[PDB]
Structure formats: structure tokens, C-alpha cells
Structure 1
Amino acid sequence: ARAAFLFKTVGFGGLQNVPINDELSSHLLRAGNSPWQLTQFLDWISLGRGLATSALVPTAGSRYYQMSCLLSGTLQIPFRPNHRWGDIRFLRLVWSAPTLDGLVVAPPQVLAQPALQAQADRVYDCDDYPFLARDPRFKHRVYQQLSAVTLLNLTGFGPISYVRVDEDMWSGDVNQLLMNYFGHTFAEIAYTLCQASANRPWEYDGTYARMTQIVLSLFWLSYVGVIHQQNTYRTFYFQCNRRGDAAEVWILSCSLNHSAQIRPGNRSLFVMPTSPDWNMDVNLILSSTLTGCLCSGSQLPLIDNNSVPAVSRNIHGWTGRAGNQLHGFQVRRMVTEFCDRLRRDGVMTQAQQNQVEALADQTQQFKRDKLETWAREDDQYNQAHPNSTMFRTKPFTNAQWGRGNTGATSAAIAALI
């Protein structure tokens, strides 16, 4: 179980403010004035069947980052030491209730008065605000989404996911529930688990918690290439027909060909992508979201201070003195890792590998060009309108395009088995 409820806000990208403005905020709240957007997010990415795109939200990672920016900017009003909610405005917006249900447009007298000036990289505690401390169910319901936001905002790279292997997790009820998900895609399972988590918070060792941990382990082990049709994990695995494409689909399948031998004991790690490609990959974002929704009911091992930037260190329940390190990979090289592991196992030929690599190279070319063009447009806009100063996507640098530690994380995930 978890005893501390700390979270971290977004940091400025060299700008003078939070990188969100009025236009983007009105775009987010066009169909619902709740800052807790995690359900509406799920309706926009459309189960991951295609490349979602908007004029103001070019990608899925763009919307995820903009939700983070809005929460980080707006939650600083009720968390001031005086703990007042309806007295001032943040970018024409005010809070509806002491219980933070939604946002409305400020009344004229507050519009006349100036706005709150937020700060970068703040760390807050949920127990400080009295209305959160009073109601535990409300605190957990919002802390799920705050945990997801912290997981995005902890470092400069993409979202962080958690992988665990343990034999004693399995039980009768877990088997009974897992059989129902045969033939479903990863996105559908993620949707249903997120809705179930929203309705009722999970026990420490409930059926749903162990279920979602097993699902994450299956997805990541299939993603690396350790587990396939001919080498299963108690007959269960994930299958992709079109590896390397812009919008991959993974399907949960059952097979009786083989069962891989599993060493006893409990093992786990934290993994994350570093290349900007994660902005267009929905499975990784959903994996991080599932970890966030899990984090409310359970307590995860601490992350080492040496794998995180300076400002994000020594957070009470998140980072620690000698915790686990972060395993970072970038997408294009992992496809080569997948193909190599399959070819060594003997289930794949050289020509098939050639075709997969060619398709993945085309995909990476397209993605890199689009992201660079959008970055250029944002720079131009920031120069033209100094009173707006916004960002549509999380910033990145060129050095993030190269590979790094990919082989190490691949080896570690294969060594989890």
C-alpha cells in the first residue's frame, strides 16, 4: 500500500510561462469543462486504429502533453498556502467548486484583476489541501490521473512503464478473467481496465491489479521477441502481423505449441522510450496510463536519483537514494532486436526480416519529418506572438534521435524470463 501522495508539475521549455495559452485550453474544453481529461483522451485516439491528427493537436503525445500542461498550470491556485480556490484566475479560467469539478470563464470583476503567475517544476502534496484530505475516495480518484501526469513529467523523455514477472500472481480468478480477453487488442483491454479503475479503486492484491500487471508483462515480453506463438507463457501471447508500421495492432492469443520454462521468484523493472517516435505510438502511452492507474492502489519500488534530472530528485515516494534505474530504448533499433531474436529462435527467415526493416525505415522517415516541421511552426508562432508563447508537443533535441542503451534494455527484458 501507499502512504505518500506527492506529484510533480510540468517545467517551462525556456518560455516565461506554462506552455499553454487560451486557444489550446478552449480546444481541450470544447466538449467538457472538466480538467480531468483521461476519458476524453480515450475517445480521441480512436482505439489506435489510425494516425489521429488535428490542427492544434497534431499527435496523441501532443494531447497528452497539453493535458499535463493544463493541470500543472491550473492546480497551483488551490495549492497556495492560503488554500483559496475562487479568488483568482489562470488564463481567463476559474474553478467551479471547492471540490475541483470543472473550469468556467472568470466573472468580470476577476477578469479586471490580474492572473496568477505559475512556476516551473513544482512538487505538491495532496494532503495539504483540506478538501482532498477530508474525502479519501475523491483523493484516490484524482491521484490516479496525477500519477499519470507525474510519470510523464518525471524526466525529459517519453512515458515510463513498469514490468513485473512473478509466478504467485496467477490464481483461479485471474485465469477465469484472463480467458475472456482472448482475441482482443491491447487498446480494448486498456480501455476496459481504465474504466473499471475509474469506477472503483482497486485493493492492494485484488484480481484487477494482478490482471493488469500480467497484461503489461505479456505485452512487453512479446514486444521484445522472447515470447511468440511457438514459445508461449502459459499459452498466452501477443501477435502483430504488421510489425514496423505507423499504427501497429497487437492481439492477445492462445496457443498450445509450447510453454516456456519460467524461473521462480519475483522480478521487475522500469522501461521507457527516448526517441520522439513515442508521440505517435499509442500502445506505449496506454501502457504508461495503466501503470499510472495502478499506482494509486499499490506502492512501486523507488527510482534512483541518478537516472532523473536534478530538480526531480528525492521526491518522497517516487525517487530515492539507491532505487532501480530506468531502462531507455528507441523504437527503430528495437525492431531489429525483435527480428534478430525471432530469427535466432528459428521461426523467421532473412527475406521477411528484410521486408520488416524496410517498412520500419519508411515509417521512421515519415515520423521524423513531420515532427521537425511541427517544431519549426511552433518556433515561428512563438516569435510572432510574444503574449501567447505556447508549445504543441513536448520539446526534444536532435541527440535524442540516436540509439542508446537499447541493447541493454532488450537484454534485461529477455533476462526477466
Structure 2
Amino acid sequence: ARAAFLFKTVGFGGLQNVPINDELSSHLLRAGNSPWQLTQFLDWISLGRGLATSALVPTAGSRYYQMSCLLSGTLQIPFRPNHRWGDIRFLRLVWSAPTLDGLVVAPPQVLAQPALQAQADRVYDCDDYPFLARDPRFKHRVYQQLSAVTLLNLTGFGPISYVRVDEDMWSGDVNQLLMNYFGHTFAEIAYTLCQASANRPWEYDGTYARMTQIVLSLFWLSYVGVIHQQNTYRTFYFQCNRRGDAAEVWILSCSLNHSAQIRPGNRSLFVMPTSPDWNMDVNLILSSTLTGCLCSGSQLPLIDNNSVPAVSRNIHGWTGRAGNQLHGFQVRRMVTEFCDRLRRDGVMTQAQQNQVEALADQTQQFKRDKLETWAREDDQYNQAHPNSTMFRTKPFTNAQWGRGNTGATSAAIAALI
């Protein structure tokens, strides 16, 4: 069970302020003034059935990053040492009520008064705020989204997910609950699980937490390619009809053909994508969100200091001196690893592999071009306006477009079983 509640805010991507402005804030708060916008994000991505887009929100990762930036820029008001909640403004916005329920336009006096200058990469403790300390349920409800934001902001790459394999997790209630999702997709399962977690925080070793861990393990094993129709984990797997597509859909399935042999014990590790094209992959973001929702009362293992930048080191609840390593991968190379593993297993042919490779190459080309164009547009806007600089997507560099530790990550995930 978690004992320390700490979180990290976003850092400036070369600018001198939090990369968000009034236009983006209004577009985010267009339909609701609550800064906690997990449900709104779920509605916006529309089950990941297609490529969502907009003028100010080109991708789903764009909206995720903007939510993180808004929370980082806004939460610094009640976390000042004086702990006052409604005397200063941030971008023509003020908190309503000490319980942090919504953001409203500033009164005329506060509008005349100067705004707050936010800082970068701040680390805060939830128990410092008196109201959060007083109310446990409120703190537990907020800490899910705070943990998701922290998992996104911890490094400069994409979000982080947690994979765990343990045979003792399975039980009668877990089997009964899992059997009900026979034909649903990963997005729908994530939607229902997230809504349930929002309604009630889970306990340390509850049925919902165990089933969430099992679902994450199944999804990642299927994604790598260790588990398939002819090699199932207790007759469960994930099927994807069009691998390498722009919007992949994964469906839970059962098969009685064969069940793999699982060594006894408890194993786990931490996965993340490095290539920028994660902005258009709903499944990865949803997996990270599920891990964040889990982090409310589970106290996951520590992350090794050497895998994170200097500013993220020695966080009381997240990083440590000796911890697990972060494994990063590239989607395009992982597709090839998937195809090769299936072919060695003997359930795929060369022509099918070639077709999958061609489709993946086309998708990668398209995504790369779109991302570069959007980055250039953002740069031009920042050059034009020097007082309202912003970013619409998390900044990336040219080096991140090459394969990294994909082979090692695939080997580790395979050895997990």
C-alpha cells in the first residue's frame, strides 16, 4: 500500500514559462470547468476507432500533454507556503472553492493585479495541503490523475507502463469477472475500469486491481507476440486483425488449442515508447492511464535513478538508488519483432510478413510527416508571438526517430513469461 503521495510537474521545453496560453486553456475548458479532464479525454478520443484531430489538438497525445501542462501551471497556487487558494490568478483563471473544484474567470481586482509566474519541474507532496490532508477520499480520487501526470512527466519520452506476471493473482472472483469481457476491446475494458476506479478507489490487493494487472500483462504479451491463438495464457489472448495499421484494434479472445507453461514466481518490469509516433496510439496511452489509476494504493516498485534525468532523481515514492530499469522501444521495429516471433513459432508466412511490413512503413511515413509539419507550425507561432508562447505537442528531437533498445525490451518481455 502506498504511504507517500508526491507528484512532479511538467518542465519548460526551452521556453521561459509553462507551454500553454489562454486559447488552449479555453479550448480545454470548453465544455467543463473542472481541471480533472480524464473523462473528457476519454470521450474526445472516441474509443480509438479512428484518428482524432482538431485545429488546436492535432493528436490524442497533444491533449494529454495539454492536460498535464494545465494542471502543472494551475496547481502551484494553493501549494505556496501561505496555502491561499483564491487570491492570485494564472492566465485569467482562478480556483473556485478551497476544495479545488473548478476554474473560473478572475474577478476585476485580480485581473488588474499581476498574475503568477510558474516554475519548472516542481515536486510537491499532497499531504502538505491542509484540505487534502483532512479528506482521504478526495486525496485518493485526485492522486490517480496526479500519478498519470507524473508517469507522463517523469522522463522526456512517452508514458510509462508497468507489466507484472504472477500466477497467484488468479482466483475465482477474478476468473468470473474476467470471463465477462470475452468479446470487448481493450479501449472498452479500459473505459469501464477507469470509470469504476473513479467511482471507488481500489484497495491494495483487490479484485479490480488484480484483474487490471492481469489485463495489462495479457495485452503486452500479445503485443510482443509471445502469446497468440496457438499459444495462450490460460486460454486468453489478444487478437489484432490489421497489425501495423494507423488505428489498431485489439480484441480479447479465448482458445482451447494450447496453454503455455508458466514458471512459478513473481516478475515485473517497466516499458515505454521512445519514438514520437506514440502520440497517435490510443492503446499505449490507455495502458499508462491504467497504471496511473493503479498507482493510487498499490505502491509499485521503485525506478532506478540512472534511467531518469537529474531533476527526477530521488523522488520519495517513485525513484530510488537501486531500482528497476526502464525499457524503451520503437513501434516500427517492434512490429518486425512481432512478425519474426510469429514466423519462428510457425503460424505466419513470408508474404504475410511482407504485407505487414509495407503497411507499417506507410503508416510511419505518414505520421512522421504530420508530426514534423505540426512542430514547424508551433515554432513559427512562437516566433511570431513572444508573450503567449505555447506548445501543442510534447517536444521531441530528431534522434528519437531511430531504433533504440527494442531488441532488449522484446527479449525482456519474452523472458517475463
The DSSP-based 3-state class of the residue aligned with 2:55 is coil
User: In structure 2, what is the equivalent of residue 16 of structure 1?
Assistant: 16
| Cα distance in 1 between the residues matched to 2:2 and 2:297 | 7
User: In structure 1, what is the equivalent of residue 223 of structure 2?
Assistant: 223
The DSSP-based 3-state class of the residue aligned with 2:249 is coil
Alpha-carbon offset, residue 297 of structure 1: 1.4
> What is the CA deviation profile of residues 7-43 of structure 1, one whole-angstrom value per residue up to 9, with x for unaligned ones?
0000001111000000000000010000000010000
> What is the CA deviation profile of residues 290-313 of structure 1, one whole-angstrom value per residue up to 9, with x for unaligned ones?
000000011100000000000000
> What is the CA deviation profile of residues 58-102 of structure 1, one whole-angstrom value per residue up to 9, with x for unaligned ones?
000000000000000000000000000010000000000100000
Alpha-carbon offset, residue 114 of structure 1: 0.2
| Cα distance in 2 between the residues matched to 1:300 and 1:176 | 26
| Cα distance in 2 between the residues matched to 1:415 and 1:367 | 31
> What is the CA deviation profile of residues 209-228 of structure 1, one whole-angstrom value per residue up to 9, with x for unaligned ones?
00000000000000000000
| Cα distance in 2 between the residues matched to 1:257 and 1:125 | 51
| Cα distance in 2 between the residues matched to 1:199 and 1:185 | 22
> What is the CA deviation profile of residues 244-279 of structure 1, one whole-angstrom value per residue up to 9, with x for unaligned ones?
000000000000000000000000000000000100
Alpha-carbon offset, residue 329 of structure 1: 0.2
The DSSP-based 3-state class of the residue aligned with 1:127 is helix
User: In structure 2, what is the equivalent of residue 415 of structure 1?
Assistant: 415
| Cα distance in 1 between the residues matched to 2:119 and 2:157 | 21
- Alignment size in residue pairs: 417
| Cα distance in 1 between the residues matched to 2:19 and 2:203 | 37
The DSSP-based 3-state class of the residue aligned with 1:163 is strand
The DSSP-based 3-state class of the residue aligned with 2:269 is strand
The DSSP-based 3-state class of the residue aligned with 2:94 is strand
Runs of 4+ with >3 A deviation: none
The DSSP-based 3-state class of the residue aligned with 1:226 is coil
| Cα distance in 2 between the residues matched to 1:405 and 1:219 | 20
Alpha-carbon offset, residue 203 of structure 1: 1.2
| Cα distance in 1 between the residues matched to 2:391 and 2:58 | 12
| Cα distance in 2 between the residues matched to 1:319 and 1:51 | 35
> What is the CA deviation profile of residues 339-380 of structure 1, one whole-angstrom value per residue up to 9, with x for unaligned ones?
000000000000000000000000000000000000000000
| Cα distance in 2 between the residues matched to 1:249 and 1:181 | 15
| Cα distance in 1 between the residues matched to 2:13 and 2:350 | 44
The DSSP-based 3-state class of the residue aligned with 1:45 is helix
CA root-mean-square deviation: 0.3
> What is the CA deviation profile of residues 84-125 of structure 1, one whole-angstrom value per residue up to 9, with x for unaligned ones?
001000000000010000000000000000000000000000
The DSSP-based 3-state class of the residue aligned with 1:7 is strand
| Cα distance in 2 between the residues matched to 1:13 and 1:339 | 37
| Cα distance in 2 between the residues matched to 1:86 and 1:416 | 50
The DSSP-based 3-state class of the residue aligned with 1:270 is strand
User: In structure 2, what is the equivalent of residue 277 of structure 1?
Assistant: 277
Q: Identity rate of aligned residues, in percent?
A: 100
The DSSP-based 3-state class of the residue aligned with 1:4 is coil
User: In structure 2, what is the equivalent of residue 146 of structure 1?
Assistant: 146
TM-score by length of 1: 1.00
| Cα distance in 2 between the residues matched to 1:71 and 1:13 | 16
| Cα distance in 2 between the residues matched to 1:2 and 1:204 | 8
The DSSP-based 3-state class of the residue aligned with 1:15 is coil
User: In structure 1, what is the equivalent of residue 58 of structure 2?
Assistant: 58
TM-score by length of 2: 1.00
Q: Which runs of 5+ in 2 are unaligned?
A: none
| Cα distance in 2 between the residues matched to 1:285 and 1:274 | 13
User: In structure 2, what is the equivalent of residue 252 of structure 1?
Assistant: 252
